[PDB]
């Protein structure tokens, strides 16, 4: 949450960067939110990804253009997040192992062909991320960066919107 | 080498997977290095991307433009390398430890704002990824595979252009 | 095979036809391969939109979109391979019975309304084709035309993309 | 003319295919007017583009461009006609052989190099196939499909216009 | 030959150049071929241009327009070429005194009204530079350099093309 | 001046060409502007080019895309000028040696890595080219052409326009 933090390397070409209108408490708590979002983001991309390569059966079509749909929703916030975070004075994480460990979504290294797995797996990830931004939006407004928390709220209704479609698709007893 | 071989899981939907017209040690000679690109285009994407949030000083805009300009011309190699792999049996790894582990690319995990530093860790990586790719089209056409080769083929004189041009750049002593 | 070889027609308006760099045996070999090759996409498309029209049940949105789709990509190479034939002194085929002799692809005359009937017949068809471009490839670069097999790396790698995707739909024991 | 009828097949996945709005003897005149449309179309891109790839002499660039022109006017009509055909409970053919014996216009199995002589065949064509659809248009009107009659005075028009360039071409002496 | 080598120069800015994958008569060999062609793609242009601003008679529009689409389809090859040459640790030269000297294709530099004479002048030149390209990627590639090579092979499938339509122009007795 | 009159060759399909509206001595005046601006515009741009191609430093993307961009700016204005000569009873030259002779700007055969080098270069021959555009203008008017001054015209602002950025680039102790 302070590996975020890079307004105080007192590295070269640093001196200027500061938290620009918050508090060093407020980007503590903004810095949180945007450095776990950004990784659970690029995950997102990655795991929609695996599964769009890796499904087969009778509604291969119907998920592996799913996610490609789904991954051009969510692809532009990867850079919006990073370069807020940045614009507050962050550095943002992008190596494999940040983003394992700030992820709220765990990319699979199995191969999974089945479709109700790769769907239910999915959308336990995104009432989970939908609901976070819900959550961070609140805290970052209470944090006094509605900026922030607007660009949340965005991020949040399309979660909420590709949550719904997943859900739909698994919500039948003859899918498997 | 053979995490990526994914014709005889004997699991459900599985059944047809085969490698084509490539015999299975062919198979392995190209799903090594198919694997091995996979990997490492997508840790360039994201270091070109850390480097890109990241810099600072009076050279911010040439490498924060150039970097994505970079982005742009290697990133549909991730889709293609992947879905080739698929093509010939394969299953296409894309977690963040899988990444780590094929990738002949490491993402840094700290703040780089000096401009040479970030140049030259890049400019070697790309001599290694350039002539990697040279080495893997001779190695898949020796394996009876021009498709894939011919493929890396392409990807080579991008890697190769890319890094001319970040050569080009610290080769400059008024650089720092 | 030779039936595609217009150098010595000795009609009118054919004086300068000749096969360019190409010795005669080398025409041979490419133009049999190239008429072959024009012939059997020619009939993919006929053969993809064939069962277009007459894909019926519950995946006729996935089929029928999909071989629109696959049609796009194999279309240009039509207009490409025939005039690959005609620059190295070639006359390409396309009556009707020319399409039915070379091609190594039958279009149906009966109408096909089962899925995994239309597909199998599909994947099997381009595993055959698949094959087929990847053995020309390597026969024109011997015979000393590194271009057209260059064509043939390409449209290798489009077909053996399109099997994946036709095979996995299949590989499904509830698809009936 | 009555093997495009596909209401009848009892096969699966065909139980709710029926006529539509027309009665079975309507249908039998549209289908047969269909059918033979659509593989007359189908040959005549075919033809178009054989004396599109055959062509040669100071007119090469005034033909073989013109043919291109054309077939990109006609060629959206071949799904167009056969989707029709399906809308009404048909079946299109699209095989060779059974192009060879429903369509009005023969693809040449030879290399025609002489202008005049692609032309006036192409003329001939076009007249026999402008004519074929004003007639057509009329049947299906009478048997009470103002639909597809209104599809044929569409392609009418297109073809007349293709005639008359195509006979102006040729109505010089000094061709030859 | 070695005019084109910007390894060796000593000079300001230049200490990092290097033959990237390639040894040093690797490089030897492909830069001569890169050098060569260069000269003559941009030789090309000139010609194309200069006959294109000529050409007079019934043919002017055939002609005039033929050369724009040609230059089009070769235009590009002038910047690849020469940064695929810089991308090894060479410079291209593009004056006027090196143009002359490598390039296989002389501008003409009368006005040449003739269309027969345009004509025959450049197909000879493009029988010469299709097999120059054609010999060249062999070279390359024996050389370990499969990535220009693959350049080449596409530079030559666009010659070919380009050649076939000129010689078909001029292969007519009525032509004069 | 002389050798791009072309109303007088007495060669075949040259019987008609003449100089429009303007007398022969007013042509030879526009016509010698023409052609030494028509050498000139292709020598810029083979110039622009080379430094494109050669140069290296911390500004090397500074200056490798300014040159783009100034060649997108001028590259329209060669045949233009060209054509323009033509459409007044003249010939337009495009051989190297004929560049070389007529152009204002001389192409470098040398390797140039240092930045101010090539700009001092360029802007050299800018202010020289600029000025040279403003004179030939008023030239013409005076030749009672006020269609080609009007051309001029617009040349001349693109010109003053690069002139201006390059020299602004420059005007730096720093830079070296
Ligand atoms: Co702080
Ligand atoms: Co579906
Ligand atoms: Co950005
Ligand atoms: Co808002
Ligand atoms: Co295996
Ligand atoms: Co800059
Ligand atoms: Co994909
Ligand atoms: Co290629
Ligand atoms: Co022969
Ligand atoms: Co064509
Ligand atoms: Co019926
Ligand atoms: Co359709
Ligand atoms: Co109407
Ligand atoms: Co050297
Ligand atoms: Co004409
Ligand atoms: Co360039
Ligand atoms: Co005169
Ligand atoms: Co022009
Ligand atoms: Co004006």
Redesign the interface.
């Known amino acids: 949450a302070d590996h975020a933090d890079?307004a105080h390397?007192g590295?070269?070409?640093?001196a200027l960067?500061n938290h620009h209108y918050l508090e060093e408490k407020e980007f503590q708590t903004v810095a949180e939110t945007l450095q776990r979002n950004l990784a659970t983001t690029?995950?997102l991309y990655?795991?929609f990804?695996?599964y769009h390569?890796?499904?087969?059966?009778?509604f291969?079509?119907?998920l592996?253009l799913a996610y490609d749909e789904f991954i051009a929703e969510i692809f532009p916030s990867?850079?919006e997040q990073?370069?807020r975070l940045?614009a507050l004075g962050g550095?943002?994480?992008?190596?494999?192992?940040?983003?394992?460990r700030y992820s709220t979504v765990?990319?699979?290294?199995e191969?999974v062909?089945?479709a109700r797995t790769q769907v239910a797996d999915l959308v336990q990830d995104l009432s989970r991320v939908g609901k976070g931004y819900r959550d961070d939006s609140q805290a970052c407004d209470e944090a006094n960066d509605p900026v922030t928390a607007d660009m949340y709220n965005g991020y949040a209704a399309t979660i909420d919107k590709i949550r719904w479609m997943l859900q739909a698709i698994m919500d039948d007893e003859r899918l498997?």
Chains 1, 2, 3, 4, 5, 6 share one sequence.
């Open positions: 890079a390397l590295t070269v070409n640093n960067v690029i995950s990655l795991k990804k695996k390569w890796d499904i087969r059966g009778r291969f079509r119907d592996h990867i850079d990073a370069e940045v550095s943002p994480l992008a190596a494999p192992a940040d983003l394992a765990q990319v699979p290294q191969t062909r089945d498997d």
